[model samples]
Target: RRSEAITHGTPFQKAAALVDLAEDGIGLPVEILDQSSFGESARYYFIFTRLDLIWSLNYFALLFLNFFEQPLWCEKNPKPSCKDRDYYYLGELPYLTNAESIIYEVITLAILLVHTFFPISYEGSRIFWTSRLNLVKVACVVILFVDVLVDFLYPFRIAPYVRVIIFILSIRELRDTLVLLSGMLGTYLNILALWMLFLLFASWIAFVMFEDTQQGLTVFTSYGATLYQMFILFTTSNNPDVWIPAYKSSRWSSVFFVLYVLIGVYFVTNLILAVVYDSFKEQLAKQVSGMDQMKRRMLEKAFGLIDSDKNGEIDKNQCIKLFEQLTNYRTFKINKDEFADLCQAIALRFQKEEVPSLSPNFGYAISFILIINFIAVVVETTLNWQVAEFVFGWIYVLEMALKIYTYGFENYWREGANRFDFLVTWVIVIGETAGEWIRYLLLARMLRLIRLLMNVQRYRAFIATFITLIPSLMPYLGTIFCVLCIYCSIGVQVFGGLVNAGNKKLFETELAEDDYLLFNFNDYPNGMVTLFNLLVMGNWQVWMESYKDLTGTWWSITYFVSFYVITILLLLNLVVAFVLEAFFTELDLEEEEK
Candidate 1:
């Protein structure tokens, strides 16, 4: 009777139900469903999943807008409106003529609305707040909503930057790239902290030794100034002018600078790189080449279920059970061998087979036409360039049609290169057909040059490295911001009115307006700006001299010098190490692919 209660269907059907429940409860929708082979004999699946494609296309469009469009558009239209000091809509550009911009705004709003309200659901349920990624995505959407509402109400500006928040969170690959980068940088934090401490200690020693030199390198009147000079020497020792003044005063001073660069710059810097490289390699292996943790667990479970015998080998009956577990009903039945092949493809992340193209010669011919299109856009004349673009637009249309005809849309879209070409061709064709109103859309055709650059092996590596490196530096940027805020507050508190022309009143003298300190730390905002200028070490000598002349106190040196030294130690050294770490790590992967 107990057995009867449990026996509701065939044994395999019960097993299938249990598997379904397991997946429904905690498992992700399988990637193998949509990501399939595009081979001639391969299963036909998901050629046009509209919701899926739109979600992805939204990301692509936002990326193009965030990285390329807004920047280039801003460059073209340099001046903001004098009408409202705070408000500037991107649509106000004279070139786009507000109409096209309005159309774009509508489309952007439509897609965002779709993403917000009707995002692709998992089965019958929504997991909108399940993961932190989704949480941030929700935050971005809420922020965007507020931006639009505020802009509508009172003409608040800078919606373009708001959209970039969504853009960064939209794509899975980019999200994973950032996650891996954070992990990589987090590993080196302790090492970086120690390196900062060492630089501080060394700076103190330099101040003690050189503060009273009173000759060459007499600028080390304060501890802060000595630290700043030492920080400058870290990367710019190649310019001998830095350490040479001190070397002229006392030849032994060369030993401090030499050993400092040798140990601090070379030894400690390379140590951080090696640590980061190892951390990055481990993550790359685990995330990129290796199966995900969920997949690994799934594979283990599948194997464990099949390997029923203690001998660790499966018999025919066990193989039959494995087959029964994986097979399911669709339009056509999937057999054991076919399902096994799909599983194999799944492990390889659905990498498509290389289908035959119209030949290498045909590609070169298309390449030449693409080059002509690029040149037409570059040395663009009103009449001649339009003629060239119009002709080339049709040529690309024909080229796209030829490829689509030969390979079919599914197979053509399977290759990444074709998808980009398809997008570029269609955009150019539409722009050409739509006439002047939509002419700016033709700029997307320039993306073909990105494709062309990607074909070069070195450019591909550099692009990959750069994309990876930027994300890794974000945490350090946050730290640098905090440091800057602290130093800015300190500067204002310590040197507020001391370095101002009004300080000449305290000293019982009068100074000309032009002789007033240009970069004084008299206010909160100005202090931040001044501190940043010191961080970049730009026209910094002028700032230091002006401050010293007005204040006439030796400790005024600390304000300029310590800010430079602390920031350089905190930001610059780690940046160099991480750059090398990303480059070397990406280079190995590039070689491995070959």
Candidate 2:
């Protein structure tokens, strides 16, 4: 008789079976059946076939509501239009009066709250409903239930009382009433509440700013008319009238608006810079930590499973099976050469064996190439602008060559060679090449001071450390960068022509016909060059001169001095100090580990 086969398996049992087959040096194809159709397998097939039909119906309903509901509601306002509509309205009355688009809004708000509070863990926990997850679920359920109650009583116009009660309950929970009494709540919940409060404040501020700017455009209109116009502008149109009048006035206004546009475009765009920087930092940190945790857990499990005989050493069969299982599960793919290397790496990790270092000096070859490129960049920048362009062209060629070399001809010729991958690689290659060319060819000689500063070991180390700290620093950095860009651009523009008695120069300039008092093209370039020069050469004369030029009165010297001292000396110094601290700390940790 054939051996009895297991008819059904639990989730844990299924997971174990997958692990076991992989351990036996075999790749198993497991078909998982739905638990609901276990009694009749034919039912599972039918359910699967109907899945698309169910999805299509749901999709169509959503589409219909999304596209037609707003227009329909507007058309039938202040009236009962359908026979079934009365029942629907009666059912919806409590919610509709209280919530005002409460159903969709409440659901969206609940989802956002869940996202903010629960945040899915990418490591450690195996269960879907971890502590974090449960907290989010509970919060969502409570909020949604309260929202539903509010909706149900809305038609009576008793929403204010309901809102007050709901808000009180929420506030109590958010504070410490329940947590203090039970001692079960965590700080993360409070953090989530604070984040929500921040969102509320931000939305309010944004609305106020929009209204303030739009007030002039709708001055002749009533409050309701203005609000309606504002709504139209927000939803369907642009603020065409906001600056049209200003532009039609004096030529000075036109010039001012152009300057405003520049600030708005170039300086305001820094907000994106700040946000991206912070986001990158956070994501990188999370990814690194998650990967490390996963690796650790996998190692422990592999060792525990393989050492079945209660000995550290494994037999050949056990060793082979372990290797096969690990390679299959841990890695994306395994080739013959990689297989050999994996064996060596695993042995090394387990303290079972050692492998000799390879003969060909890959490190030395790479170093030589980098050194050549560095020298070429410097030489081309100093010698001739045209040579810089040539150097950029060669860099692109080398980049392409490196790509082809790494990928191999056969790999590039593969059927599913990714277009996205190709495009990204080429874009980076082109950007770097062009940047190098521009830096050398277009920028003035004094700008070379900035390049030299960038080349400094400490500076490079600071940048590397900053990149490492990005995950931790992004949110704060983004906020700071946003504020700085706005403040700096305004400062530059406002003081452009008023800073000096037109005597002291911020920068050495070929163009001396224009007054050097303000932030003209000459002053702007000069100020940047002077800043770098001061940083590199440690001479404060140019900085002092710029400061003196900026202030005309005797008392103004104190103000200019304080501003420069704070910005350049204090704040910039703090930035450098933080970078150095991070670098030294990292280095010391590495040394300790070694």
Candidate number achieving the greatest TM-score relative to the actual structure: 1
C-alpha TM-score for every candidate? 0.53, 0.29
lDDT of 1 by residue, 1-594 (tens): 011211343443333332332332332234321122112111111222335778778755753442222222232343442222123211222333345545565577678766754433421224444555556767776776675566356322345555655655665555555566677667667886787688699888877877667522466667776766666566553336666667778798778877888897678867766676677668667764434445434333334333344435455665566446434320033333343344545436632333433377997797778777666766664534457667776887899899999888866886655787798677666555336533344455445555456578769888777657656766556556546656655565555555432334433322223332434554445565677777776556556655666677756776766665456643565566668768887989988888
lDDT of model 2, residue 425: 37
Where in model 1 is the C-alpha error above 4 Å? 1-49, 52-113, 117-136, 139-165, 215-218, 237-241, 247-255, 288-291, 296-342, 345-397, 422-594
| Superposition TM-score, candidate 1 onto the true structure | 0.53
**lDDT at 583, model 1:** 86
Cα-lDDT of candidate 2: 0.37
